[PDB]
């Protein structure tokens, strides 16, 4: 067997009344071979 399973929890939809937050700055990064992002590029 496996150690993990999945359970549907919602539909894929946009919510017009969704809260708005977060900023949109530009950041210089590099993607290493481990699939992880590194700063300062």
């Amino acid at each position: 067997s496996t150690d993990m399973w999945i359970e549907r929890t919602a539909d894929i939809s946009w919510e017009s009344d969704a809260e708005i937050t977060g900023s949109s700055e530009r950041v210089d990064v590099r993607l290493d071979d481990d699939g992880n992002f590194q700063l300062m590029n």
Binding site: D34, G35, N36, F37
Partner: protein
């Protein structure tokens, strides 16, 4: 015991929730912490037994 048994637990930069175990000297025993899925350090074990066997 290995030196990395002294390093503090490290969650990492990813957002998965993987309960792992780390050795806490102050407590002399192993405790659970949330591992994020990436950049794991050595003081990170899948079970309390494995953690104690290595850092006990």
């Amino acid at each position: 015991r290995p030196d990395f048994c002294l390093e503090p637990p490290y969650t990492g930069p990813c957002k998965a929730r993987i309960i792992r175990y780390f050795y806490n000297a102050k407590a002399g025993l192993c405790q659970t912490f949330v591992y994020g899925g990436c950049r794991a350090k050595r003081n990170n074990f899948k079970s309390a037994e494995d953690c104690m066997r290595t850092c006990g």
